[PDB]
Design a protein around this ligand. Structure first.
Ligand SMILES: CCCCCCCC/C=C\CCCCCCCC(=O)O[C@@H](COC(=O)CCCCCCCCCCCCCCC)COP(=O)([O-])OCC[N+](C)(C)C
Ligand SMILES: CCCCCCCC/C=C\CCCCCCCC(=O)O[C@@H](COC(=O)CCCCCCCCCCCCCCC)COP(=O)([O-])OCC[N+](C)(C)C
Ligand SMILES: CCCCCCCC/C=C\CCCCCCCC(=O)O[C@@H](COC(=O)CCCCCCCCCCCCCCC)COP(=O)([O-])OCC[N+](C)(C)C
Ligand SMILES: CCCCCCCC/C=C\CCCCCCCC(=O)O[C@@H](COC(=O)CCCCCCCCCCCCCCC)COP(=O)([O-])OCC[N+](C)(C)C
Ligand SMILES: CCCCCCCC/C=C\CCCCCCCC(=O)O[C@@H](COC(=O)CCCCCCCCCCCCCCC)COP(=O)([O-])OCC[N+](C)(C)C
Ligand SMILES: CCCCCCCC/C=C\CCCCCCCC(=O)O[C@@H](COC(=O)CCCCCCCCCCCCCCC)COP(=O)([O-])OCC[N+](C)(C)C
Ligand SMILES: CCCCCCCC/C=C\CCCCCCCC(=O)O[C@@H](COC(=O)CCCCCCCCCCCCCCC)COP(=O)([O-])OCC[N+](C)(C)C
Ligand SMILES: CCCCCCCC/C=C\CCCCCCCC(=O)O[C@@H](COC(=O)CCCCCCCCCCCCCCC)COP(=O)([O-])OCC[N+](C)(C)C
Ligand SMILES: CCCCCCCC/C=C\CCCCCCCC(=O)O[C@@H](COC(=O)CCCCCCCCCCCCCCC)COP(=O)([O-])OCC[N+](C)(C)C
Ligand SMILES: CCCCCCCC/C=C\CCCCCCCC(=O)O[C@@H](COC(=O)CCCCCCCCCCCCCCC)COP(=O)([O-])OCC[N+](C)(C)C
Ligand SMILES: CCCCCCCC/C=C\CCCCCCCC(=O)O[C@@H](COC(=O)CCCCCCCCCCCCCCC)COP(=O)([O-])OCC[N+](C)(C)C
Ligand SMILES: CCOc1ccc(-c2nc3ccc(-c4nc5ccc(N6CCN(C)CC6)cc5[nH]4)cc3[nH]2)cc1
Ligand SMILES: Nc1ncnc2c1ncn2[C@@H]1O[C@H](COP(=O)(O)OP(=O)(O)OP(=O)(O)O)[C@@H](O)[C@H]1O
Ligand SMILES: [Mg+2]
Ligand SMILES: [Mg+2]
Lengths: 669, 575
């Protein structure tokens, strides 16, 4: 079982904290359980203890109370004679205590004395005698009980105060362990998502991956705090009740053990349903997040084209499904809850009455009624713990579903290994050999790609829209593996090298620039390598971004909002271009870098490039043929195939697609 | 309570449901109090052999009826109470989304898209428990406490009841202080969820950049730091949450000792009957549960108070651009004349537009060119009404832009963003955004007017190709042509092409420009371009230098004026 056998491992990792929490919980539960029994002992020995026999003894008994000139002694405080003189009972009829100095009595039945206390239990009611004890004589009788209570209440006070720390420690440790486990879960999931291929990200909304990391981990915390605490407490309580039951009866506590199967069965019936709904709920949650991320990131278009009504309608379907499935869990949580356990309790009472009712015909149980008060009290105490655990099934099932959804991601078979950045700078020899590629099965987007780039050269890729140039870039970076053919950096195939090394051999300017949160210098430097401010400023000046700096107060320290919303697209492209140029890559790849950048800044960028392009291989994918006019070799792609290649003069000398495109770009004048 | 006072708007709307729930709860309390007395009577009658056959058939029947009644009414009030908590989530989510859908970029600049998601999936969960489990515990514990207080005051005595209550005020103050602190702690912790969501989003939306530069190690470390920060703010809430149980247990144990001591003293002085004290001790034993209940309630209420506060903060953001209360009945835009327009972005400090004044007559095509970061798209955004109006005025045929409902103005304008924006749908679905109720022939015409039929043939499924999230399953030029088709589908009065030919080769660019020239003849167009071959037909060309129109006129005069336009023209055509 992946779900059950996996949550155990995370608990096992932090076994010290959880074991300590369990021990503190056990001690606190033991103390709390004991308390009321100390109270009961105090009661029965100090305030109700003036009722048992008071043997008529003389003085010098280490304890005695004067009463009408004769000092008596309690039953237990007495030393060890046998039947010293007689039994002088005490009885409290109404609200006043009456002394029985005449003789012994039997099982008492309180009745007004009128000078003769009538104990009407059966027929033996002799109406012995009575003497009101006033108030001072009663206080004299009770003084040693004052001593006992004062020396026993402080015991309860101590047990109470010294048990305050244990509750806090138990709860704090449980929550600390839960938070640590959630932290580990999130870190592992993020590492795995870092280990997954790009295909996973391209066809999966970004809101469905954030949900599995944050939303689906918050719901597992309860499994370690509330559920574990309640289960431990109820287990201890029921162990106490059952061991207590077994001592005073057999064959009547064995039947009570039948509660254990039922609860298990109950769980089995609950789970089967609580599973199906929970999954759906969780699923819909992810969708909502996606809808909250897809819509927010594209709100400008939604408002510009007046798509608010449809978007709200699209969102409302998910909300309605979530609400409906939550309601379906309402029925299950209503049928199997406090209600059902209270149903069983009444059923248990009815069974007890019917069994003993069929035995009370001969008055069998009344003679053996010593097992009725205790049995009923224990049965009533039994169901208080049970109601505690049955309420934890919902949380347990939700946590199980969330954990399963996290683990199915954490156990994905498809995965790409990792390495370390390059150790020796590459010469810059990039070669494509007979490369055939297909994003989708049976559809070759590149067919027999063959070319070679030498160090210190500039290979330019040209072609109509959709030709497959960015696909060549993807294959070079190994975002997508090829299907037939090879790609070689120097003489080494890119498939025998670690992806990190290959990607460290080159720095790229992607077609659509992306800017992270932070300062402009952070984006240019990505917070790695040697982020000397002078070097970053030099790169920015090389790209021609200097005006942007003097149009900002803090320069390279100017904050950048998410996605750089407060920067023009051209400025974002310049920042990404400077980021690419700041790493001093062995191989520089430009993917339509100057698309949103004017011609003046483009010329400045070209001038900066030319200065240091004598020892660095460069790949240029440009729809502006001016930038690649002086390039070592241009390649023209058509439907994913290279049809023409060579220097610019060679391309023009043979007419063709490049000739037509250059003439169209050139002034028709 | 603050949370209940804040949710009074909902509680007023849903009053019959909660009234029924409360009535059923009190009834269930009484009908559960009865079974104990009935069983006690049965056992007592079983003592002297007076339990007869009739007694069995009466006790069994009454117990069965009691069980059925309690079961049904409990099912019903749990349906009503908890069922009202789900409506909390539904209503709050609907309100939040409807508020987001009417929010302009200035709102979204300040509010991250990870924080907002956590405000609609987690804060609602926190707030939901207040109206469900929160209300149940409140009323249930209050009734149980009042029953214990009253029974001890009429059955046993009054002095004892007033004796074992002195601890209670101290418990109330302590729990109130703990809740006050936990409110702030939980507000701090909840925000750490939005930060985590934003961190996860950034590492996903920008996976290509991270992987290309080999920043995975520096990305996992940042996420680990964020998780550690989240954990730290969770413990600051635990340190206070763990104080609710020990305080209640201590200040109930003190009540137990006070009650027992006072009862013993009263018995010694002969105020009690020695059977009143046993029942009083039994009653004291019961008091513990309502106190744990009130502690848990106070813990939950503050947990929902912070989340509700954040949701209200989101929902109390007044609109940046206000739909006019008394609009103008203008039907079509004739002249778009800027007059001394000065506009500065909210987060900026330098005037992005400075004394701009130009006229776009009906049917004219206007081109705007200039070096990067000059202000070209700012004029288009002035037309789009994304930011609060600046100075000056923008009159649509003599009526200011403000006195025009946003729906009509947006229907007029067909916008092509400079940054491609597409959703995870089929190509046809995206193209239909301009006109949802559009026949396939209109889509085909729009596609053919953007030079995209060849791509449709090339594509696997044609118009039914699922474009990945943000359109990552398409080329940049294909995205641009899809956007152009989207804009052209509606046949807008004003067509805004904001650098719509950037990844469109040169033959495709020429074809699209020729089609536009033959499609927008006699209609208003704003063409923003860095290539000056796409503005040769414009009646008015505006050169933007740092928020000010440096030059103006058509192609001929700008060429005759030398300067930036002639420089770029020569560098772009004579090359
Ligand atoms: C230590 C920290 C917590 C550890 C959690 C263990 C995992 C868990 O939820 O237990 C178990 C759930 O068990 C139940 O749902 C309770 C059954 C009574 C794990 O469930 P499982 O592994 O799916 O199988 C359960 C038992 N089965 C095989 C009979 C279906
Ligand atoms: C019933 C079987 C229960 C069981 O443990 O099964 C497990 C099998 O695991 C084992 O049987 C492993 C036994 C060796 C574990 C040694 C470390 C104990 C630390 C103890 C640290 C405990 C800390 C947490 C304490 C709450 C799996 O349990 P499941 O996946 O639920 O099925
Ligand atoms: C430890 C201290 C906690 C609790 C101890 C409390 C002691 C109760 C008072 C006994 C008084 C007496 O003389 O017996 C009377 C009551 O007897 C009974 O109630 C039956 C025997 C009870 C054994 C203890 C039950 C808790 C077990 C807990 C299991 C471990 C869990 C707790 C520790 C983590 C009469 O008995 P009779 O049979 O009618 O004659
Ligand atoms: C701190 C104080 C802790 C003790 C409080 C006892 C209070 C009490 O009810 O005492 C009673 C005495 O009862 C006995 O004499 C039996 C219980 C104590 C001795 C046996 C050890 C505990 C049994 C638990 C074993 C747990 C399972 C095994 C171990 C895991 C008072 O009796 P009375 O009739 O009021 O006079
Ligand atoms: C301490 C440091 C500071 C020093 C300052 C200087 C202090 C100087 C002071 C000196 C006085 C020294 C004697 C004190 C005891 C008095 C006893 C007494 O009054 O007996 C009475 C009861 O007994 C009690 O009242 C018991 C009091 C116990 C208190 C325990 C506190 C610790 C709790 C810790 C909890 C931790 C959680 C009566 O007993 P009796 O047998 O019924 O009476 C016989 C009958 N006759 C009266 C009719 C004849
Ligand atoms: C764990 C050992 C095995 C594993 C070893 C290997 C792993 C070791 C790794 C990490 C271990 C880190 C420590 C955790 C262990 C508990 C002890 C401790 O110091 O922790 C804490 C909890 O401690 C307690 O709760 C102990 C009992 C005292 C409670 C005092 C306050 C409440 C008192 C009752 C009042 C009730 C009201 C009364 C009426 C008004 C101490 O408290 P803190 O504030 O969290 O500490 C501050 C430090 N901090 C700033 C960094 C957070
Ligand atoms: C106890 C008794 C209740 C008996 C009725 C069950 C109806 C469940 C309905 C439901 O929503 O279930 C859901 C959860 O379902 C599961 O995940 C468990 C599937 C159990 C199989 C059906 C009952 C087995 C009877 C046991 C033995 C005999 C017991 C006595 C039987 C009388 C799935 O339902 P669905 O069909 O996937 O929903 C279709 C969706 N639609 C409704 C929108 C179209
Ligand atoms: C510094 C500030 C000092 C403030 C001092 C305040 C005065 C202190 C003096 C005296 C104290 C006693 C009077 C206080 C006034 C009543 C509370 C209140 O504001 O209610 C209002 C908001 O209330 C709601 O709309 C929310 C109601 C939620 C009820 C939740 C179920 C509980 C059952 C509860 C059963 C029903 C009872 C519900 C309560 C009406 C009622 O307004 P309405 O909706 O327009 O009508
Ligand atoms: C003794 C005490 C109980 C007496 C019961 C008397 C019979 C009653 C029976 C039936 C009457 C049913 C009336 C139908 C009304 C439907 C419409 C409606 O108002 O629905 C409402 C819910 O209302 C309910 O669903 C009420 C449920 C009552 C349960 C009673 C359990 C009695 C069990 C007895 C067991 C005995 C066992 C005997 C032995 C076997 C809708 O909610 P709302 O608040 O409108 O929410 C929207 C608000 N808005 C519209 C403003 C947006
Ligand atoms: C003396 C006992 C007296 C007991 C009387 C019983 C009367 C109960 C009241 C009616 C409830 C109907 C219900 O929930 O149906 C739902 C079925 O939904 C499912 O099938 C979902 C799965 C439920 C699993 C339950 C397993 C076993 C329950 C434990 C089995 C043992 C329980 C009994 C133990 C003795 C659908 O209902 P609805 O219409 O969609 O929802 C609104 C319902 N409303 C209109 C009523 C408000
Ligand atoms: C603290 C109060 C004083 C107790 C000590 C005392 O008086 O002992 C004396 C007994 O004295 C008596 O016989 C009278 C006891 C009066 C205690 C206060 C009555 C109200 C209980 C209020 C509840 C407080 C319970 C406290 C725990 C929360 C011992 O001295 P002596 O007999 O002269 O020898
Ligand atoms: C004379 C000396 O002996 C005594 C004997 C019995 C009682 C006694 N008096 C009682 C009054 C209340 C309760 C009681 N039983 C209940 C059962 C359930 C509920 N709830 C709370 C939980 N929710 C889910 C349902 C309703 C509260 C309840 N309150 C029991 C009681 N037991 C007192 C002294
Ligand atoms: N939301 C914004 N808040 C603040 N400043 C902004 C915002 N958007 C753009 N800017 C800045 O305002 C100035 C003008 O930007 P604008 O986008 O209008 O230029 P542009 O001419 O359209 O640029 P490009 O040629 O790059 O598309 C630049 O400094 C830009 O950084
Ligand atoms: Mg591309
Ligand atoms: Mg722009």
């Amino acid at each position: 079982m992946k779900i059950g056998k996996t949550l155990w491992r995370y608990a096992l990792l932090y076994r010290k904290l959880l074991i300590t929490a369990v021990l503190l919980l056990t001690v606190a539960v033991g103390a709390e359980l004991t308390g009321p029994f100390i109270g009961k002992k105090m009661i029965d020995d100090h305030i109700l203890g003036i009722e048992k026999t008071w043997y008529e003894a003389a003085e010098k008994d280490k304890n005695a109370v004067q009463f009408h000139g004769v000092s008596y002694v309690r039953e237990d405080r007495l030393q060890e004679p046998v039947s010293k003189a007689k039994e002088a009972h005490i009885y409290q009829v109404g609200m006043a205590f009456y002394f029985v100095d005449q003789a012994v009595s039997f099982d008492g039945n309180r009745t007004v004395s009128d000078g003769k206390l009538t104990i009407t239990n059966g027929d033996k009611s002799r109406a012995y005698a009575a003497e009101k004890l006033t108030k001072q004589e009663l206080f004299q009788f009770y003084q040693p009980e004052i001593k006992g209570m004062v020396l026993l209440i402080c015991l309860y006070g101590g047990l109470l105060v010294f048990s305050v720390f244990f509750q806090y420690g138990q709860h704090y440790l449980l929550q600390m362990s839960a938070n640590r486990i959630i932290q580990k879960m999130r870190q592992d999931v993020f590492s795995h998502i870092q280990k997954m291929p790009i295909r996973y990200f391209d066809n999966l909304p970004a809101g469905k991956v954030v949900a599995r990391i944050t939303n689906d981990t918050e719901a597992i915390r309860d499994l370690y705090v509330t559920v574990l605490s309640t289960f431990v407490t109820s287990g201890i309580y029921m162990f106490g009740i059952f061991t207590a039951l077994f001592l005073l009866d057999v064959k009547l506590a064995f039947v009570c053990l039948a509660i254990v199967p039922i609860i298990w069965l109950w769980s089995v019936i609950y789970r089967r349903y609580a599973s199906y709904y929970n999954q759906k709920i969780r699923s819909i949650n992810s969708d909502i997040n996606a809808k909250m991320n897809e819509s927010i990131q594209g709100m400008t278009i939604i408002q510009a084209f007046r798509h608010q009504k449809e978007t709200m309608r699209e969102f409302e379907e998910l909300n309605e499904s979530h609400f409906y499935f939550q309601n379906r869990m309402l029925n299950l949580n209503s049928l199997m809850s406090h209600n059902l356990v209270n149903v069983i309790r009444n059923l248990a009472f009815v069974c007890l009455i019917w069994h003993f009712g069929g035995a009370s015909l001969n008055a069998a149980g009344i003679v053996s009624i010593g097992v009725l008060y205790a049995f009923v009290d224990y049965l009533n105490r039994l169901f208080q713990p049970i109601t505690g655990i049955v309420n934890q099934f919902s949380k347990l099932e939700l946590a199980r579903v969330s954990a399963g959804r996290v683990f199915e991601l954490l156990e994905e078979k498809n995965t790409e290994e990792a390495g370390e950045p390059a150790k020796e700078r590459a010469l810059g020899r990039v070669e494509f050999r007979d490369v055939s590629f297909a994003y989708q099965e049976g559809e070759e987007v590149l067919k027999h790609i063959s070319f070679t780039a030498q160090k210190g050269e500039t290979v330019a890729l040209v072609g109509h829209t959709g030709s497959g140039k960015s696909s060549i870039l993807n294959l070079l970076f190994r975002f997508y593996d090829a299907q037939k053919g090879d790609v070689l950096i120097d003489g080494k195939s890119i498939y025998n090298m670690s992806r990190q090394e290959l990607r460290s051999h080159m720095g790229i300017v992607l077609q659509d620039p992306y800017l992270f949160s932070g300062t402009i210098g952070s984006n240019v430097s990505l917070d790695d390598e040697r982020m000397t401010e002078e070097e970053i400023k030099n790169a920015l000046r090389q790209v021609g971004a200097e005006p942007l700096l003097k149009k900002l107060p803090k320069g390279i320290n100017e904050p950048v909002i998410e996605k750089g919303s407060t920067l023009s697209s051209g400025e974002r492209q310049l920042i990404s271009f400077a980021r690419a140029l700041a790493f001093d890559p062995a191989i520089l790849i430009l993917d339509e870098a100057t698309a949103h950048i004017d011609t003046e800044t483009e010329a400045v960028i070209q001038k900066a490039l030319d200065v240091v392009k004598q020892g660095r291989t460069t790949f240029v994918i440009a729809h502006r043929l001016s930038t690649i006019r002086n390039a070592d070799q241009i390649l023209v792609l058509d439907k994913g195939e290279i049809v023409e290649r060579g220097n610019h003069e060679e391309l023009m000398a043979l007419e063709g697609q490049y000739y037509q495109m250059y003439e169209l770009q050139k002034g028709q004048k | 309570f603050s949370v209940l006072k804040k949710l009074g708007w909902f509680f007023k709307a849903y009053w019959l449901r909660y009234t029924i729930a409360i009535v059923l709860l009190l009834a269930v309390n009484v009908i559960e109090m009865f079974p104990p007395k009935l069983l006690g009577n049965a056992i007592d009658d079983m003592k002297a052999g007076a339990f007869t056959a009739e007694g069995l058939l009466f006790y069994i029947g009454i117990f069965f009826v009691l069980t059925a009644a309690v079961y049904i009414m409990s099912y019903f009030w749990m349906h009503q109470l908890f069922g009202g908590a789900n409506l909390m989530e539904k209503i709050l989510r609907t309100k939040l989304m409807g508020h987001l859908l009417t929010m302009s970029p200035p709102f979204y600049e300040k509010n991250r898209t990870g924080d907002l998601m956590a405000r609609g999936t987690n804060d609602l969960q926190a707030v939901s428990l207040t109206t469900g489990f929160g209300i149940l515990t409140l009323v249930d514990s209050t009734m149980f406490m009042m029953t214990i207080f009253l029974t001890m005051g009429f059955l046993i005595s009054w002095k004892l009841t007033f004796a074992a209550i002195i601890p209670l005020p101290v418990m109330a103050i302590a729990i109130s202080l703990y809740g006050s602190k936990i409110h702030e702690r939980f507000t701090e912790a909840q925000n750490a969820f939005g930060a985590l969501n934003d961190r996860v989003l950034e590492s996903v939306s920008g996976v290509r950049v991270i992987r290309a530069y080999v920043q995975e190690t520096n990305d996992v470390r940042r996420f680990n730091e964020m998780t550690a920060d989240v954990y730290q703010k969770n413990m600051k809430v635990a340190f206070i949450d763990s104080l609710f149980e020990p305080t209640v247990k201590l200040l109930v144990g003190a009540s137990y000792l006070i009650g027992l001591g006072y009862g013993a003293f009263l018995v010694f002085r002969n105020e009690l009957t020695l059977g009143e004290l046993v029942s009083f001790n039994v009653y004291l034993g019961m008091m513990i549960w309502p106190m744990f209940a009130i502690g848990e309630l106070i813990n939950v209420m503050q947990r929902g108070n912070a989340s509700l506060d954040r949701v209200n903060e989101t929902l109390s953001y007044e609109t940046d651009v206000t739909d006019p209360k008394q609009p103008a009945d203008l039907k079509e835009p004739g002249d778009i004349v800027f007059s001394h327009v000065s506009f500065t972005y909210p987060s900026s400090t330098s005037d992005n537009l400075q004394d701009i004044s130009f006229t776009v007559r009906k049917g004219q095509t206007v081109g705007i060119a200039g070096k990067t970061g000059s202000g070209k798209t700012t004029i288009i955004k002035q037309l789009l009404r994304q930011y609060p109006p600046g100075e000056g005025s923008i009159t649509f045929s003599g009526v200011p832009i403000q006195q025009i409902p946003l729906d009509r103005l947006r229907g007029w304008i067909g916008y092509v963003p400079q940054d491609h924006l597409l959703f995870s749908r089929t190509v046809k679905e995206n193209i239909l955004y301009g006109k949802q109720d559009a026949t396939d022939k209109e889509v085909q015409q729009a596609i053919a007017e953007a030079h995209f039929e060849k791509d449709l043939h090339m594509l696997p499924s044609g118009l039914e190709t699922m474009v990945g999230e943000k359109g990552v399953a398409l080329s940049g030029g294909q995205k641009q042509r899809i956007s152009i088709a989207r804009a052209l589908m509606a046949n807008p009065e004003i067509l805004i092409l904001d650098d719509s030919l950037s990844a469109v080769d040169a033959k495709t660019e020429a074809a699209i420009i020729k089609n536009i020239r033959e499609n927008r003849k006699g209609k208003t167009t704003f063409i923003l371009t860095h290539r000056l071959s796409a503005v040769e037909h414009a009646d008015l060309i505006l050169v933007m230098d740092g928020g000010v129109i440096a030059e103006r006129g058509t192609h001929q005069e700008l060429l005759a004026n030398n300067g930036w336009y002639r420089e770029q023209y020569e560098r772009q055509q004579l090359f």
